[PDB]
A paper describes a structure:
Transient receptor potential ([name]) channels are ubiquitous cation-selective sensory ion channels that respond to numerous physical and chemical stimuli and are often considered polymodal signal integrators. In this study, we present cryo-electron microscopy (cryo-EM) structures of crTRP1. The crTRP1 architecture is unique; it exhibits overall C2 symmetry and its ankyrin repeat domain (ARD) appears to bend towards and interact with the lipid bilayer. In agreement with a previous study, we found that crTRP1 requires both heat and the lipid PIP2 for its activation.
Author numbering:
A (entry chain D): 743 to 783, 813 to 848
B (entry chain D): 372 to 443
C (entry chain C): 17 to 33, 53 to 246, 324 to 666, 717 to 793, 805 to 869
D (entry chain B): 637 to 665
E (entry chain B): 17 to 53
F (entry chain D): 584 to 636
G (entry chain B): 849 to 867
H (entry chain A): 849 to 869
The structure:
Amino acid sequence: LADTYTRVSTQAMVEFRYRKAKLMASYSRRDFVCPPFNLLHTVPLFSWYFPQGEEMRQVVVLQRRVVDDFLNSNRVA
Amino acid sequence: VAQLTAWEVKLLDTCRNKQEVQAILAPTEDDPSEPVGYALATFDKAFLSHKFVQQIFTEKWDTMGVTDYTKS
Amino acid sequence: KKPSDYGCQLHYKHARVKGTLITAAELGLVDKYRDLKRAGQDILTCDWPYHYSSILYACYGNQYKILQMVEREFVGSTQELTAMHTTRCWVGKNSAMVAAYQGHLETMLYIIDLDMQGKFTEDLFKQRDVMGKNAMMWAASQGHTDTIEVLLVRSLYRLLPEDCADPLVLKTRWKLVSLLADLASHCRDYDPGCSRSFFQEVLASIKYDPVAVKLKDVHITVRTLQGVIVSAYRAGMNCMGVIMYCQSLLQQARYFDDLVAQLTAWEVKLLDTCRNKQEVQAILAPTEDDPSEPVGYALATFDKAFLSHKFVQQIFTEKWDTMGVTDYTKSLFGVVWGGCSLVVAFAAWATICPLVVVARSFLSPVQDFMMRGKVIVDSRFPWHVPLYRWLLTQCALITFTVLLSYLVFSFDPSDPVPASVAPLNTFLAVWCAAILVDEVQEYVEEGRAEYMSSGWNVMDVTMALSYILHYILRIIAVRVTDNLNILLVVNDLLAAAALMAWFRMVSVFELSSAIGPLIQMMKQMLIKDVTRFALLVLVILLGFSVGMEALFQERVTGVIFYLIFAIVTAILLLNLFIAMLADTYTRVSTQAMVEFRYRKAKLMASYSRRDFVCPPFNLLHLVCAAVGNGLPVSMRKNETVPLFSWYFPQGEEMRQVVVLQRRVVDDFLNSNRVALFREKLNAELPNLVHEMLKQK
Amino acid sequence: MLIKDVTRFALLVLVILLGFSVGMEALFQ
Amino acid sequence: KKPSDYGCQLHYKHARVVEPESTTDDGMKRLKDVGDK
Amino acid sequence: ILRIIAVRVTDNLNILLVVNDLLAAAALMAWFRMVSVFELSSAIGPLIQMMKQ
Amino acid sequence: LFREKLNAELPNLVHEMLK
Amino acid sequence: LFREKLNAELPNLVHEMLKQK
Amino acid sequence: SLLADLASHCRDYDPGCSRSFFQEVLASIKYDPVEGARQEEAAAAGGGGSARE
Amino acid sequence: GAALHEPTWGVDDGE
Ligand SMILES: CCCCCCCCCCCCCCCC(=O)OC[C@@H](COP(=O)(O)O[C@@H]1[C@H](O)[C@H](O)[C@@H](OP(=O)(O)O)[C@H](OP(=O)(O)O)[C@H]1O)OC(=O)CCCCCCCCCCCCCCC
Ligand SMILES: CCCCCCCC(=O)OC[C@H](COP(=O)(O)O[C@@H]1[C@H](O)[C@H](O)[C@@H](OP(=O)(O)O)[C@H](OP(=O)(O)O)[C@H]1O)OC(=O)CCCCCCC
């Protein structure tokens, strides 16, 4: 009773939100149909993966606005 | 471990919008190192349950609010 | 060249490498849309299965460039554009809902841009759809945090007035509109070669000429919310309202819990900046200049850090009690004498209250005498003590639980035909009509959300149904004058009204801390942890009840090894249920003095507006309130009297309150200016400790 | 627990069991 | 132009009846409940 | 498979008493699998993860 | 007591050594 | 332990550094 | 150098020239730690611009 | 050593 209450109170949404994220990414890589129509007969995970041209030029500016304020934050903390 | 875990949630909280979440989590052509796919491969829970990473999955997975026409 | 220990662990694994102005606007061809229009078409062409206009497609696919090209020759008056942007959708959207339906910064900056011009005659972002969402409730439900911040800057811009002329209110209006023009900063028009960035006329009409980009330069941090709270106060506003309004935006944004919990601790910080009762009622006062009550707002957005403060709890105490009658309980003399006067005055109430109901509604000066009260609360005029309105609606509540329990205790099917129309059963039916009429006029008077939030407003209706549909099924189904049928439901619904009767009696401990914060605790782990666990048990219990049938359809090692799987799974579930109530106990026992004081202040205000009558007299006064107009108040004295007496002050007491709040708020805004100055120094110590170890 | 946990609970269990007893009494008649 | 985006969120909803001379002090306020005798 | 062997040699305690036992395990694992509809729903999702841990 | 006035007020002491 | 000799001495060290200054 | 301190001995197997433990990895790094500190503690006295923030 | 006196610097000088 008090070994699940240690886990229900602390990490229960975190165990839920992680399983929800492993379910929404099992379908971004999945092929075609379910057990019905299965015996009757390298894609990227995200559409914002690998920006090519001007979208790459904005992201590499954008990550030096976030990381260089995070490393500047841990240096003071 | 419990400092590096509390540094990868502290970086995710530094991002203020959605474009700054997929700017650090995206593999470019220079460094093709995706950290999202490494979080699914090592069962990272303190990263994958954050509210800015739970959003970027829900925009690829739903993208029409079909799960939002329920609280009516 | 082989990849490193870091390389082949983290790197990317796989080796990568019509017309009709419907698909003309969805794709983004600007020239094709103009040529098909010049031949002749409809700019509001409606596709069937989703009512999407041609204008509304351009907001959908982020090609705003069509919507600027529509502005050149295809709109006349500024009313015609609003007919074309707010057309409809099939789910209820307009142009600024579909562009915030998915994150479309380049288009939602455009519809915001036309709104700050005034090109629309309507508040285009304040409209609602058929679902009930907003233009900003859609950007927060999906989570598009990039266009939430564009919506939040507009809502923080409409707050600050256009009419005022002040350097501190004109600096942080050009500071907000530059934060959207810098946020666009690109994406020029359909026609190349035109001086039009995205925001020119809104930066022009602002009266402000100023004389390595970080992350705090392009976002709404605490530094720009303090710059709005002080600068809505310069233009002349309720500083307790602008804090309560800016927090109601950022709670709707759903992704700023760094600024909600900073603004929540700015309204508790402001409240105890006051010293006495004269200074609390100054800053909470809706005077004639800014008639904005933030007490009445905060018990409409359920502001528990405000409503449970030790100062707001004493501006309600001086109205509803102000005699210490609630503390004639923790003593030896107070209970036996104050409780003795309770049963006397309740007997004095029931034998005088229908007499003063009919005398109030007819032409007599005793309606002047019943108004002689309610400006001082004491025992000289006990009918306008809001505690003595609460004691009589509970003493009438206890009577209904006794008199209905007395009905089932003296009951048998051996009674004659004169038992359906009885001196007891018929009186308990006009009570349940007086309950249901009360719950109707507590639904439309307060609202839908302010009524279905208590948790007992279901049990008022339910026992007023299962006794009305018991007295009806006593004259429709039982032997008075009718036929014979299966009548178990007639005697079943009586306990369905009797169970909820004594459960309704627990509302008499809605005061009394340490008996109070258990009933909320009991009604927290029953609405969210009982209907939730019994669904997951039900889909598991159907597995065993069907899995039982598959065994015995065609031995002890088959069933006892089946049973040990059921005793384990029942223990493994009861292990999870007890840890689900001991979890919910810990969530509500820590806030036991905030969840109680908030729930106390929602009935020190609900009973302070309402009358001294009608737990049964909503069929005895409502029948004479319509007659008194036919031959004069029904429920309009709750709304005319403004909840207090230190409200709208005429004369030279307003000349002291506005003097008094400028020594509370101005002695608060130079305290946030000192606490935030340390945060400018908090993230600077490796540049200050390096100087003091160089000067030394 | 006889000082602090009885007089605040046994008044509140009593209002429940009287409701269930009356709700049983109209189901046994 | 009238309900400026928080006017119909925060301003006092009902229409009050302006009394001619109503003192809101601690004394000389309760003159309609107690006598002047 | 084992139900078409039920037309063969009659044992009826060695062969037929395990046929119904597999079908209960066929269905008991199937409605436990019906819990997997609530994987996305908040307030039932944490109930499945705590029943898993 | 001076530890609860050097904890929450340490940035205001390393400011008057600069001036 | 040398810091504990300095730990219970700060209202005699902070008074000196705010006098030398 | 955190490992060359963790060895600090192992005069390997012979009177060979003391081979500290990593004498051909520290010498393959192009770093002198008396020239690195001086252009860091002085560039950090200008507020910033030493390496990055 | 000044049984209720303690050295104070100043909390002011914000914006
Ligand atoms: C409670 C409102 C939804 C109930 C109506 C659902 C009935 C079945 C609809 C079947 C049509 C499927 C169309 C939608 C497809 C789909 O994705 O369904 C998934 C879902 C349904 O849709 P969903 O994603 O909207 O379901 C959840 C749910 O509504 C939560 O109550 C919200 O949390 P909340 O209580 O804090 O508001 C979540 O919001 P969030 O996402 O932010 O975490 C939301 O995801 O899959 C299901 O079919 C499960 C059936 C849902 C019934 C749950 C009964 C729970 C009763 C007790 C809870 C109330 C007390 C709250 C406790 C905190
Ligand atoms: C019977 C007493 C004489 C009548 C006077 C009626 C006055 C009245 O109704 O008070 C509630 C009463 C007293 O309970 P109780 O002894 O625990 O006293 C309450 C509590 O102990 C705290 O002292 C106060 O809360 P807080 O720490 O200061 O926050 C609270 O006042 P408030 O601050 O919360 O307001 C006190 O009332 O609760 C009952 O159980 C009797 C129900 C019978 C109700 C009447 C019959 C329906």
